[PDB]
């Protein structure tokens, strides 16, 4: 059918010319800054040397600079020709043509790329290019030219490619075939006069339901990944330069940036001439900042304060010369989404959101891609969702009509959605031939509006103007309550808990000193008292490791050591330095000060004797048998049984072997008890397994009301040895029947069933959590507190916490070494149903005691008339510039009770203020809605 | 998915009003003309009587007239309402509102239909409507109205229907669903104000690659079918009237007519006011005559003279006030096509052709639907071919986008093809809502040219202007040599040979007297001599039964008796009257005249002794054993073995039972011989079968050079009895190996293989032929002459002629009764290879002898210096208006030899003239091309 005759023939087979200049070429390498090397160039004879040939290398962390001094050949003849220099793209680097140094040019784009030499100025210039190693040898040759001949070659390549994508039943496929025919006729027998003429004839063969197809070129950059931050800091400057050279070459282009800190990275590295580059670039057009967010992160693990700073400290750039923005919120690589996001968005002045994964196309009780998200708070979020092709559809895309068809099926709207650029790497490239892409697509389809029109230059702001018109304001709409569920690729989330232990301890610790440091305002006045400039710098370093890829611990071994480096550590070390600092001139009013933040036995007979409860491990079995309440009457049989099953997948996802029996840790145990006291009781029982390894958990608790508490504390200490690729968990089967699982999400409590959605794919079902998870019919249940482990699962009502994971990924630090784990099991009652939530989250508190000399009185309870047990205040902090402070509260128990808010203060005034710390004229609500975040601001 | 919620809901469920007028209504019936009944109405009391109710009936050939006298209700109120009268469509009839009689109105349209009452004139009028019976009772009620409300109901019905046809993956399907949603909202709770308003809102929801989709409303009418000619003569006037009322209602509409005689039928029936109706109708626009052909017929069975008259005598209307024409040639219902058609078309001034069946979509060594036909003559024919959906795609079509997709796949072009109207019935209807159809399709798709534009008002003449531009003039193009092959539905073609015997004998007989009647021109001058006006009327009646459906004998029993009526008979009877007439004053120069047209034994030892050949039937077997040539050396084993196999299909197609053994006629035969002489030898052998029936064939031949001839003559006489649904054939296996079968088509010899094309579907393979079929390696072979049987088959080189067929169709005359059949078997040699063709075709000649008184000399051979054995002159005749005569010749043997043409005459001049008898300035060719028809004209 002549299918392989037209397609594979001409696609393979003045005009393009290749000249070679061997001399004047220099090479440089550092085996030990662009401004530092410019002074080391002209002076004497340094490591800069003549290359003139291909330079091989070997694996190193070193970077290799390269210098090419080119003299323009002849005068007029080769000037009209297009000047070009081809380079082989290495792992990283930069390219410059500095005098002395004005420019910064793009590198990080794909292995194929073009560098244009200015035809405006006739003379000799210089070139500075470095190549990051990880080895990749560069192929460098000068390439002259024509533009019209190469255009036809590209247009034909995108022609026949579009012929294959078009339906064979349509006449267009037979048309495009005949179009690929006539072109091949004059193209074959090597004729320049025919090629240029045939290009004109092809255009004549080209030009002879309201819908729209658009796209926005973007670069998604991970600040920490298998390449480090310092190296990727050089990678982000390559993303800006590719646009700058594209602007003069092509107009109407659109770029978006998920990092507000990206601006600062460029302003710190290139403060001089590139601060004045951004202003005409951003203000006029062609640039948009999405979300104005300081960090792109997973929202499940951290608190709302992490989401509070990124909005506020990312809005700080708006105070500088900046501020052309968009209403879209972009978290493409983020796994999972919080249920408080619809509430956080509207308050942050951002009305749109984008989600890559976590969706399906079918009747789900859900129509399509485009979606209006209604959280459990009751608020609504209009969000724009890309199809199942994700962001890799338009990434490095020359295929034209290929994914255009697959985009139309999931989406209805009046139009589709395309995201240009790659989100996997040091940063995404932006192709320079996109100008022809938009043009050649306007060659196939006619102009005027009848058939869908092709415009790549439209902005999402105008796109959101279209959705406000076509579709109704709505009452009954696409509706999904809570979060979304698809293949999560949880992976490292529960793996390498040691980086969580450091972070989660640093999380609370940095969240510790915040508010109380504003309570010393009255004591010693200067600015009064608050580490405004001091704590601002603190949040700068911490948010850097909190990114979506970095925080769970999925990365190479090099940057993983930078996670356990002072980056995480010194934060705790500086905060523990400040907490011992501010105390000196403060606590001096305290003789003996207990510092805590709030606002108002037997062996053979196997018993630990007390009133509250009883939990018993059988003899020689090693497994807890009876957990039973006398007053309640609930008896348990199948507790705390540790289970170890291997893992055969990589760091990304988790895939267990087919029907693999999980090895129990039960063995010929021995019995022991740590101490002897009414205050302290710890009974020790040893567990062992094949390839002997010591797995230790501890038992701690306070009796009743001599010790006082309602909850046990069980901490696990395990030093891993030998066998890798294993996944360890501890089971807490409730032996109870409930279709609902109580779990506390970020700023609230979400309601999720015991069984996953019927559309679920992956066998293994695990859920990420903050602190505790419960099962409650409201008259009773079982509550499980935990530390350093964010994961858990619903087994058919068997509570299983994930202690450790060891992926087969190329990381050797995820396998062996000691670990300190902690968790708990708590008895549940209807009266204690609101108590278990209160005794869970903030239990991470660490007791600390210190005393100065005595002059004063140390008892002051300064909080004013609120007293709501159903509400919990997560964050209260100051401002930037005044020093007005903000107060943010959220209701713990919601969905049933309507919390009356009497919260107020004295000696000053108060007004309700959103999460962006921006002034809002409703006033303080006397009653809080269920599952509502209440944030306020305080002024003198 | 709410699929059956939107689609089946609102589709089922001032405004429409139904009023009943019982009085003033009259009914009439003839159990025994519109002009005859108008005088019988007002006078006295006739069979016209009060009806006022529904009138039941019973099967009859009668027609029932009906009269409704309607008085306009009130004045203004019901005047604004749309006046309508609904009738139940019967088999046939006419509808009139005569004063006294001006109008003729359309009836034959489908059971649903509308009759509009004029709102211009306020008063009382009359209605005349007759109903043909075959019984169908009419439901008649007066219907008032609004137009805007009914429009929305239709537009919505065509909306949701288009929603189902559109791909579910596209957003258009989800869009049209939402369009069907909002409409149903205000439509449900019975609100006139909402409906009229929602109709406007729907239009707002509507309006918000170069291709074209067009169509032409047409009516294909069979002049003789299961309803007779006299009754369908009333049916054709209903086709014109439907257009006339449509013209004022809607513009740009296009109609086409395959019958040039259709004009005469209307001019004979309505000569007065309807002769002046056609002129503004045809001349301006909206009407086109396709092919200008007198008859639509199968071209395989008759001669070229039948195709010659239909062009010429159909061009006679052009001499009247007429002549807006098209270049298209239309034979949709015609089974099979001649190979001389590409030659006949270009000469007739008609450059395009249309074919319904006989095509396939695949790579056949053939691209698509659109085709350039190159005959075996070497000439090219550009033809337009409808898709596999044939003409029933757009027939009675409210389905919109339904067949629009299936039309695009077989065809490439720049555009598709649609044929509106039904070709099966007394005549095709043309719907009055086509105005909204074009409009609502312009509602879905936007305007201006980007996407395909919808125009139903374009003419094929302008369509052929588009094909001359887009596609190349061409050298290598779609190419198919000879005829086309698909399921033929041969059927009645070989069935009921008795109507062929009468026609084929009438064919030659009417073709007999033609030319020689111009040879008496000199004898007795008045106009000189020729039956110009006499033979013109002869061809009028004959061509009437030669139509594609009528000629093969597929029809009801009523009109089948009209086939054996004087219609066929009197033609022979009038021609045998004229041949005995013109002879009287002509042959008187002949004492004894032999009139022929041309230009220069044993039993037990089982032998008929002579020199030329030997053919022997074995004793008691009944089957011929050895047919052998001594000089040539070819011996045959397996001849003339009659075979009878049943048939389980209808008249249309032929389907044999699965692996059914064909019963041989061999039986305990007896031997006999008719006469005894050297001049006459006939040996008789009886055959019999179960349910005893006498099957007789005869043996006749002339020996060598006392009798002289090279060919045997075997005639079969069989009187059918008992068992029906059988198919009888006689086998002549050659016992030879040839991949080619020599067969003489109409005006030439086509070359067809022994095996059917690999794309063939139906098991049984049979071929229609004129006279003989041969198998020749050119050194030898076997030639089979036959009479009254047009069918034969290729069995793997076994020659099988079809004697009779008896279909299961509702025709009882195709079963039983006597039949007279004739055929032959001829020996073949390289020297006689050109002889066998010459001894085959015209052998149908019948010897006739008569003598007058003697004065004169009877020998004159008047032909002038041609003498080409490879050429054969089929037709030479006179003109219409002068009386110049034309001469048409065609080469019998072609594909190898180039025939030198010395043909000329004396005492006058000669010029080459096409098949339309139109003057052409190349002159007489001295050499004829292979397979070329040479036609000339003679002037005084």
PDB file of N, CA, C and O in Angstrom, chain B residues 657-692:
ATOM      1  N   UNK B 657     -28.067 -24.566  -3.200  1.00  0.00           N
ATOM      2  CA  UNK B 657     -27.979 -25.236  -1.908  1.00  0.00           C
ATOM      3  C   UNK B 657     -26.540 -25.662  -1.640  1.00  0.00           C
ATOM      4  O   UNK B 657     -25.757 -25.841  -2.573  1.00  0.00           O
ATOM      5  N   UNK B 658     -26.192 -25.826  -0.368  1.00  0.00           N
ATOM      6  CA  UNK B 658     -24.828 -26.189  -0.005  1.00  0.00           C
ATOM      7  C   UNK B 658     -24.523 -27.618  -0.437  1.00  0.00           C
ATOM      8  O   UNK B 658     -25.222 -28.552  -0.043  1.00  0.00           O
ATOM      9  N   UNK B 659     -23.475 -27.757  -1.251  1.00  0.00           N
ATOM     10  CA  UNK B 659     -23.017 -29.025  -1.840  1.00  0.00           C
ATOM     11  C   UNK B 659     -24.175 -29.939  -2.249  1.00  0.00           C
ATOM     12  O   UNK B 659     -24.345 -31.036  -1.717  1.00  0.00           O
ATOM     13  N   UNK B 660     -24.962 -29.480  -3.217  1.00  0.00           N
ATOM     14  CA  UNK B 660     -26.083 -30.259  -3.722  1.00  0.00           C
ATOM     15  C   UNK B 660     -25.719 -30.934  -5.037  1.00  0.00           C
ATOM     16  O   UNK B 660     -25.310 -30.272  -5.990  1.00  0.00           O
ATOM     17  N   UNK B 661     -25.867 -32.253  -5.082  1.00  0.00           N
ATOM     18  CA  UNK B 661     -25.505 -33.011  -6.272  1.00  0.00           C
ATOM     19  C   UNK B 661     -26.466 -32.720  -7.418  1.00  0.00           C
ATOM     20  O   UNK B 661     -27.678 -32.885  -7.286  1.00  0.00           O
ATOM     21  N   UNK B 662     -25.910 -32.286  -8.543  1.00  0.00           N
ATOM     22  CA  UNK B 662     -26.706 -31.986  -9.725  1.00  0.00           C
ATOM     23  C   UNK B 662     -27.108 -33.270 -10.441  1.00  0.00           C
ATOM     24  O   UNK B 662     -26.261 -34.091 -10.792  1.00  0.00           O
ATOM     25  N   UNK B 663     -28.409 -33.440 -10.651  1.00  0.00           N
ATOM     26  CA  UNK B 663     -28.937 -34.663 -11.244  1.00  0.00           C
ATOM     27  C   UNK B 663     -28.686 -34.721 -12.747  1.00  0.00           C
ATOM     28  O   UNK B 663     -29.076 -33.817 -13.487  1.00  0.00           O
ATOM     29  N   UNK B 664     -28.033 -35.789 -13.189  1.00  0.00           N
ATOM     30  CA  UNK B 664     -27.799 -36.010 -14.610  1.00  0.00           C
ATOM     31  C   UNK B 664     -29.075 -36.504 -15.282  1.00  0.00           C
ATOM     32  O   UNK B 664     -29.930 -37.112 -14.637  1.00  0.00           O
ATOM     33  N   UNK B 665     -29.200 -36.242 -16.578  1.00  0.00           N
ATOM     34  CA  UNK B 665     -30.401 -36.612 -17.318  1.00  0.00           C
ATOM     35  C   UNK B 665     -30.235 -37.980 -17.982  1.00  0.00           C
ATOM     36  O   UNK B 665     -31.118 -38.443 -18.705  1.00  0.00           O
ATOM     37  N   UNK B 666     -29.098 -38.623 -17.732  1.00  0.00           N
ATOM     38  CA  UNK B 666     -28.827 -39.945 -18.290  1.00  0.00           C
ATOM     39  C   UNK B 666     -29.822 -40.984 -17.771  1.00  0.00           C
ATOM     40  O   UNK B 666     -30.151 -41.004 -16.584  1.00  0.00           O
ATOM     41  N   UNK B 667     -30.296 -41.840 -18.672  1.00  0.00           N
ATOM     42  CA  UNK B 667     -31.327 -42.822 -18.350  1.00  0.00           C
ATOM     43  C   UNK B 667     -31.336 -43.948 -19.394  1.00  0.00           C
ATOM     44  O   UNK B 667     -30.559 -43.904 -20.348  1.00  0.00           O
ATOM     45  N   UNK B 668     -32.207 -44.965 -19.222  1.00  0.00           N
ATOM     46  CA  UNK B 668     -32.298 -45.994 -20.269  1.00  0.00           C
ATOM     47  C   UNK B 668     -32.849 -45.455 -21.587  1.00  0.00           C
ATOM     48  O   UNK B 668     -34.012 -45.676 -21.929  1.00  0.00           O
ATOM     49  N   UNK B 669     -31.992 -44.747 -22.313  1.00  0.00           N
ATOM     50  CA  UNK B 669     -32.337 -44.116 -23.581  1.00  0.00           C
ATOM     51  C   UNK B 669     -32.619 -45.112 -24.704  1.00  0.00           C
ATOM     52  O   UNK B 669     -32.235 -46.279 -24.627  1.00  0.00           O
ATOM     53  N   UNK B 670     -33.297 -44.635 -25.744  1.00  0.00           N
ATOM     54  CA  UNK B 670     -33.456 -45.391 -26.982  1.00  0.00           C
ATOM     55  C   UNK B 670     -32.914 -44.572 -28.152  1.00  0.00           C
ATOM     56  O   UNK B 670     -32.854 -43.344 -28.081  1.00  0.00           O
ATOM     57  N   UNK B 671     -32.520 -45.250 -29.226  1.00  0.00           N
ATOM     58  CA  UNK B 671     -31.907 -44.576 -30.366  1.00  0.00           C
ATOM     59  C   UNK B 671     -32.880 -44.430 -31.535  1.00  0.00           C
ATOM     60  O   UNK B 671     -33.661 -45.336 -31.820  1.00  0.00           O
ATOM     61  N   UNK B 672     -32.825 -43.283 -32.205  1.00  0.00           N
ATOM     62  CA  UNK B 672     -33.689 -43.016 -33.349  1.00  0.00           C
ATOM     63  C   UNK B 672     -33.065 -41.957 -34.259  1.00  0.00           C
ATOM     64  O   UNK B 672     -32.143 -41.252 -33.856  1.00  0.00           O
ATOM     65  N   UNK B 673     -33.560 -41.863 -35.490  1.00  0.00           N
ATOM     66  CA  UNK B 673     -33.070 -40.870 -36.442  1.00  0.00           C
ATOM     67  C   UNK B 673     -34.236 -40.230 -37.198  1.00  0.00           C
ATOM     68  O   UNK B 673     -35.093 -40.928 -37.742  1.00  0.00           O
ATOM     69  N   UNK B 674     -34.267 -38.899 -37.211  1.00  0.00           N
ATOM     70  CA  UNK B 674     -35.370 -38.146 -37.807  1.00  0.00           C
ATOM     71  C   UNK B 674     -35.608 -38.470 -39.281  1.00  0.00           C
ATOM     72  O   UNK B 674     -36.617 -39.080 -39.634  1.00  0.00           O
ATOM     73  N   UNK B 675     -34.677 -38.061 -40.136  1.00  0.00           N
ATOM     74  CA  UNK B 675     -34.832 -38.245 -41.574  1.00  0.00           C
ATOM     75  C   UNK B 675     -33.676 -39.038 -42.172  1.00  0.00           C
ATOM     76  O   UNK B 675     -32.740 -39.415 -41.469  1.00  0.00           O
ATOM     77  N   UNK B 676     -33.752 -39.295 -43.473  1.00  0.00           N
ATOM     78  CA  UNK B 676     -32.665 -39.951 -44.187  1.00  0.00           C
ATOM     79  C   UNK B 676     -32.333 -39.221 -45.482  1.00  0.00           C
ATOM     80  O   UNK B 676     -33.136 -39.220 -46.414  1.00  0.00           O
ATOM     81  N   UNK B 677     -31.132 -38.648 -45.540  1.00  0.00           N
ATOM     82  CA  UNK B 677     -30.648 -37.856 -46.674  1.00  0.00           C
ATOM     83  C   UNK B 677     -29.207 -37.405 -46.460  1.00  0.00           C
ATOM     84  O   UNK B 677     -28.705 -37.407 -45.338  1.00  0.00           O
ATOM     85  N   UNK B 678     -28.551 -37.017 -47.548  1.00  0.00           N
ATOM     86  CA  UNK B 678     -27.227 -36.411 -47.476  1.00  0.00           C
ATOM     87  C   UNK B 678     -27.368 -34.934 -47.120  1.00  0.00           C
ATOM     88  O   UNK B 678     -26.469 -34.331 -46.532  1.00  0.00           O
ATOM     89  N   UNK B 679     -28.513 -34.362 -47.479  1.00  0.00           N
ATOM     90  CA  UNK B 679     -28.814 -32.970 -47.167  1.00  0.00           C
ATOM     91  C   UNK B 679     -29.221 -32.806 -45.707  1.00  0.00           C
ATOM     92  O   UNK B 679     -28.844 -31.833 -45.052  1.00  0.00           O
ATOM     93  N   UNK B 680     -29.994 -33.763 -45.202  1.00  0.00           N
ATOM     94  CA  UNK B 680     -30.556 -33.669 -43.859  1.00  0.00           C
ATOM     95  C   UNK B 680     -30.215 -34.886 -43.004  1.00  0.00           C
ATOM     96  O   UNK B 680     -30.577 -36.014 -43.342  1.00  0.00           O
ATOM     97  N   UNK B 681     -29.517 -34.653 -41.896  1.00  0.00           N
ATOM     98  CA  UNK B 681     -29.220 -35.718 -40.944  1.00  0.00           C
ATOM     99  C   UNK B 681     -29.515 -35.291 -39.511  1.00  0.00           C
ATOM    100  O   UNK B 681     -28.877 -34.381 -38.981  1.00  0.00           O
ATOM    101  N   UNK B 682     -30.485 -35.950 -38.886  1.00  0.00           N
ATOM    102  CA  UNK B 682     -30.769 -35.726 -37.473  1.00  0.00           C
ATOM    103  C   UNK B 682     -30.963 -37.048 -36.736  1.00  0.00           C
ATOM    104  O   UNK B 682     -31.913 -37.780 -37.002  1.00  0.00           O
ATOM    105  N   UNK B 683     -30.066 -37.336 -35.799  1.00  0.00           N
ATOM    106  CA  UNK B 683     -30.146 -38.553 -34.999  1.00  0.00           C
ATOM    107  C   UNK B 683     -30.739 -38.237 -33.628  1.00  0.00           C
ATOM    108  O   UNK B 683     -30.275 -37.332 -32.937  1.00  0.00           O
ATOM    109  N   UNK B 684     -31.760 -38.991 -33.237  1.00  0.00           N
ATOM    110  CA  UNK B 684     -32.518 -38.678 -32.031  1.00  0.00           C
ATOM    111  C   UNK B 684     -32.192 -39.609 -30.866  1.00  0.00           C
ATOM    112  O   UNK B 684     -32.194 -40.832 -31.009  1.00  0.00           O
ATOM    113  N   UNK B 685     -31.915 -39.013 -29.711  1.00  0.00           N
ATOM    114  CA  UNK B 685     -31.650 -39.761 -28.489  1.00  0.00           C
ATOM    115  C   UNK B 685     -32.447 -39.169 -27.326  1.00  0.00           C
ATOM    116  O   UNK B 685     -32.317 -37.986 -27.010  1.00  0.00           O
ATOM    117  N   UNK B 686     -33.273 -39.997 -26.696  1.00  0.00           N
ATOM    118  CA  UNK B 686     -34.191 -39.523 -25.666  1.00  0.00           C
ATOM    119  C   UNK B 686     -33.529 -39.422 -24.290  1.00  0.00           C
ATOM    120  O   UNK B 686     -32.700 -40.254 -23.917  1.00  0.00           O
ATOM    121  N   UNK B 687     -33.885 -38.374 -23.552  1.00  0.00           N
ATOM    122  CA  UNK B 687     -33.494 -38.232 -22.154  1.00  0.00           C
ATOM    123  C   UNK B 687     -34.713 -38.066 -21.256  1.00  0.00           C
ATOM    124  O   UNK B 687     -35.710 -37.461 -21.647  1.00  0.00           O
ATOM    125  N   UNK B 688     -34.621 -38.611 -20.047  1.00  0.00           N
ATOM    126  CA  UNK B 688     -35.722 -38.561 -19.095  1.00  0.00           C
ATOM    127  C   UNK B 688     -35.181 -38.404 -17.675  1.00  0.00           C
ATOM    128  O   UNK B 688     -33.993 -38.613 -17.431  1.00  0.00           O
ATOM    129  N   UNK B 689     -36.052 -38.030 -16.743  1.00  0.00           N
ATOM    130  CA  UNK B 689     -35.650 -37.834 -15.355  1.00  0.00           C
ATOM    131  C   UNK B 689     -36.820 -38.167 -14.425  1.00  0.00           C
ATOM    132  O   UNK B 689     -37.910 -38.493 -14.897  1.00  0.00           O
ATOM    133  N   UNK B 690     -36.594 -38.094 -13.115  1.00  0.00           N
ATOM    134  CA  UNK B 690     -37.645 -38.351 -12.130  1.00  0.00           C
ATOM    135  C   UNK B 690     -38.795 -37.369 -12.317  1.00  0.00           C
ATOM    136  O   UNK B 690     -38.570 -36.223 -12.713  1.00  0.00           O
ATOM    137  N   UNK B 691     -40.017 -37.816 -12.024  1.00  0.00           N
ATOM    138  CA  UNK B 691     -41.218 -37.055 -12.363  1.00  0.00           C
ATOM    139  C   UNK B 691     -41.183 -36.766 -13.856  1.00  0.00           C
ATOM    140  O   UNK B 691     -40.925 -35.636 -14.273  1.00  0.00           O
ATOM    141  N   UNK B 692     -41.444 -37.806 -14.645  1.00  0.00           N
ATOM    142  CA  UNK B 692     -41.045 -37.871 -16.049  1.00  0.00           C
ATOM    143  C   UNK B 692     -41.401 -36.634 -16.863  1.00  0.00           C
ATOM    144  O   UNK B 692     -42.540 -36.169 -16.867  1.00  0.00           O
TER     145      UNK B 692
END
